[PDB]
Amino acid sequence: MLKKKQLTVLDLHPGAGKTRRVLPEIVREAIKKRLRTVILAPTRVVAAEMEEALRGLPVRYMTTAVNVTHSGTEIVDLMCHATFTSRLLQPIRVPNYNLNIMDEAHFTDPSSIAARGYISTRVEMGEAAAIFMTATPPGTRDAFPDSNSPIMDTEVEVPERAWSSGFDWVTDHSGKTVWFVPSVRNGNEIAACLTKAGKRVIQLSRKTFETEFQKTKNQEWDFVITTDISEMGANFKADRVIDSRRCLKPVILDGERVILAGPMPVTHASAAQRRGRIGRNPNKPGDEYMYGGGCAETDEGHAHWLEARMLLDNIYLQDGLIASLYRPEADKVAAIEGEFKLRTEQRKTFVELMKRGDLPVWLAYQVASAGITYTDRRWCFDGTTNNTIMEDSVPAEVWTKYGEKRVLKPRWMDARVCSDHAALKSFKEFAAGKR
Ligand SMILES: NC(=S)Nc1ccccc1OC(F)(F)F
């Protein structure tokens, strides 16, 4: 694995021990060979579980998720996928790692795709080695891979709305269920229905994941209602998965706006990771996977791959060269390498709109490429009437930084800034000049 110009896909089945058994063996070998190594965790939750699996090995935890005192001698760094891509984009020296390990390397967030593109390009150049750890590499067609114990797979109608009858199997269960929903708002409705039926429910999404995930350990629960974020190495002591088999697809229309299309079918990889939450205990056969639709390759034309190209166009590689997407996922976008390359000041703006602005990549790019500076929020108000953002069926309103009440009507409409109450709250604070 560890020889330069090698990229290895460690594709053992979910629960095969890639993170807790294989990764420490790789890390020990890497330290023996004096390879400057980076380990990329998808989430802070996985970063913390990695510290336990790697404990005693000299690893620098580049995350506040781990409360350790680093010796200063470590040649192995551990950080989140997003932190890697963030540091590449910022005016900060990222070491030229000899070995690049990405855990949960199926993660389809733009920063994860960009990180794979950067790493795979360095390997192709002959500069580095890489290991991508995932049961479900890009283009996998197998939604039902092997497991530690037999799974009961059942195709069944799964509710996506509150229900009164017809789904007794949902509530008759006496164990613990992880339920994959296509959105936060959809999970809110299902969670309310279960809570009304006397169930204890925890809800997980990207913005709440670290905090809320700890509830799965610290309190008794009957259901976890989760978006696709729990595909990224989230482990539950569960005996059933209910999978809508649906997700939202961000789609750029006419190069002009982003909509959240669907819900529509998940990929085979997503379905295999959702299922893969259970069947993990070789002493507990007959965990259940109930699935409510088929799979499709909904990553094709999905905005995250175009957003990854905007990130990679703005990362220095060598002179004017630009990193390519990782070959197996490179056809998922119709993009021209370099088309999103920004001049110095516009690039800095782009980075800050993502890092401090917390705006989606596509929206950050529209603003920066228009020659708008980070603190200039006029664009949040001067869009067409059809870009009016609604709050409970009325136009959303903010007080501008000037103290004027205005309708939120962004010049560029990206549905992710108002996908749920928390998103819209964050975007209101942005339009108001509060960050
Ligand atoms: N525990 C430490 S001293 N970690 C660390 C070391 C070097 C860079 C970043 C780091 O993360 C931090 F900033 F959260 F501490």
Single-letter amino acid, residue 108: T
Assign residue 34 a region (left: φ > 0; alpha: ψ between -120 and 50; beta: otherwise): left
Evaluate: CB of 65 within 6 angstroms of ligand 1.
no
Nearest CA to ligand 1 atom 7: 62
Q: Is the CB of 122 under 6 A from ligand 1?
A: no
Q: How far apart are the first and last CA of the chain?
A: 44
Chain Cα centroid distance, residue 146: 24
- Tell me 262's DSSP state: E
Burial of 85 (0-12, 13-18, 19+ CB in 10 A): buried
* Cα gap 169→176, rounded to integer Å: 13
Q: Look up the CATH superfamily of 7-133.
A: P-loop containing nucleotide triphosphate hydrolases (3.40.50.300)
Q: How far apart are CA 348 and CA 359, in angstroms?
A: 14
Place of tokens 């070789």: 282
Q: Would you tell me how many other CB atoms lie within 10 Å of the CB of residue 291?
A: 23
SS3 322: coil
Q: How far is CA 43 from CA 67, 99, 264, 350, in A?
A: 16, 20, 25, 23
CA atoms within 13 A on the CB side of 194: 27
What separation in Å is there between the alpha carbon of 90 and the centre of ligand 1?
A: 17
Mention every residue, 6+ apart, whose C-beta is less than 8 A from residue 55: none
Backbone angles phi, psi at 302, to 5 degrees: -75, 135
Q: Which amino acid is at 349?
A: T
Whose structure tokens read 């330069």?
4
* CA 85 / ligand 1 centre spacing (Å): 16
Compute φ and ψ for 9, nearest 5 degrees: -95, 105
Cα–Cα distance, 81 to 240 (Å, whole number): 29
Pocket flag, ligand 1, residue 64 (CB < 6 Å)? yes
Cα separations in angstroms, 93 against 13, 74, 76, 97 = 36, 17, 16, 12
For 163, the token pair is 């229900």
> Are residues 245 and 292 in contact, defined by beta-carbon separation less than 8 angstroms?
yes
Q: Is 70 in the pocket of ligand 1 (CB under 6 A)?
A: yes
- Return the DSSP state at 321: B
Helices then strands (H, E): number in the chain? 13, 18
Cα separation of 411 and 379, whole Å?
5
Bridge-based pairing state of the strands 287-291 and 240-243: parallel
How many other C-beta atoms can be found within 10 angstroms of the C-beta atom of residue 428? 20
What does the alpha-carbon distance between residue 312 and residue 265 come to, in Å, rounded to a whole number?
Answer: 28
Kindly report the CA angle at 164 between 163 and 168, in degrees rounded to 5?
90
Say how far apart CA 148 and CA 275 lie, in whole Å.
Answer: 12
Strand partners of residue 321: 318
Contact 1, 22 (CB under 8 A): no
Report H helices in 226-301.
268-275
CA-61 nearest atom, ligand 1 = 4
Please state the separation of Cα 286 from the chain's center in Å. Answer: 29
Q: Residue 175: which of 140, 223, 212, 139 has the closest Cα?
A: 223
Q: How far apart are CA 305 and CA 120, in angstroms?
A: 15
Structure tokens at 230: 């729990």
Nearest CA to ligand 1 atom 9: 62
Other beta carbons within 10 Å of 80? 21
- State how far the Cα of 383 lies from the Cα of 299, in Å rounded to an integer: 29
> Residue 68: CB within 6 Å of ligand 1?
yes
Cβ atoms of residues 101 and 131 within 8 Å: yes
Q: How far apart are CA 275 and CA 273, in angstroms?
A: 5
Domain covering 152-291 assigned CATH 3.40.50.80 in the classification? no
CA-to-CA distance for 176 and 236, rounded, in angstroms? 9
Rounded (5°) CA angle 83-231-14? 110
Inter-residue contact 42 to 63 (CB < 8 Å): no
Ligand 1 pocket check for 62: Cβ under 6 Å = yes
Question: Pick from 185, 182, 207: which is nearest to 358 by CA?
Answer: 207
* Gap between the Cα atoms of 431 and 102, Å rounded: 36
Select from 36, 38, 50, 60 the residue to mutate for testing ligand 1; criterion: most ligand atoms less than 8 Å from CB: 60
The two beta strands, 240-243 and 223-226, are unpaired
